[PDB]
Structure 1
């Protein structure tokens, strides 16, 4: 029961993490807090000009934030609660 939540901004991931943790704990999941997981970022160095001026460039950043949540106790009530969770698209839940 390993919930892999990955998002682009922590500002949204924090609310989803708090909500899932609360929903799981209320029944007895014995779930550990949101486990901070290392981020993965990819850079895209790009020429800012059209034709000339190779030296001029612009760098855009890819940032992805993900955190793990593990549930120990079966407590199928927790699974039922998890099944009915509706959150924004930035979470991309994956068990």
Structure 2
């Protein structure tokens, strides 16, 4: 009766990459099963967090450095689909590590 499409973006942010990919795949599969209009898994530029730190505590000896870094992986799945469907999706397909998140408002 409703069939009210709010236009819903699923964000998918993570560090672990393979896991994220798997999650995305799962989501896609779910969508296919439910048979909806959606834009495919858009992948955004991998933001890298860099922390340069002198390896030493005491600053004595040669001046050596360690670039410790964090990889951020950010994906978007845009669903032209209802509210109920979105809710259902949210309910099923949750894995550890990946930050599942929904915008909901076009």
- TM-score, normalised to structure 2, is 0.77
Q: Residue 12 and residue 87 in structure 1: after superposition, are their counterparts in 2 closer, same or farther (change >3 A)?
A: same
8 Å CA contact 1:8, 1:63 repeated in 2: yes
Q: Given the alignment of the two structures, is residue 20 of structure 1 paired with residue 20 of structure 2, yes or no?
A: no
- Where is the strand percentage greater, Structure 1 or Structure 2? 2
Give the superposed CA RMSD.
Answer: 1.8
Number of residue pairs matched?
94
Q: What residue is the counterpart of 1:79 in the other structure? A: 87
1:9 aligns with 2:16: yes
- Gap runs ≥5 in structure 1: none
- Quick one: distance in 1 between partners of 2:74 and 2:46? 7
Change (3 A) 1:82 1:29: farther
Segments of 4+ moved more than 4 angstroms: none
Contact 2:23–2:93 (CA<8 Å) still a contact in 1? no
Kept in 1, the 8 Å contact 2:26–2:93? The answer is no
Q: What stretches of structure 2 of length at least 5 have no aligned partner?
A: 1-7
**Of residues 42, 64, 69 in structure 2, which corresponds to 1:61?**
69
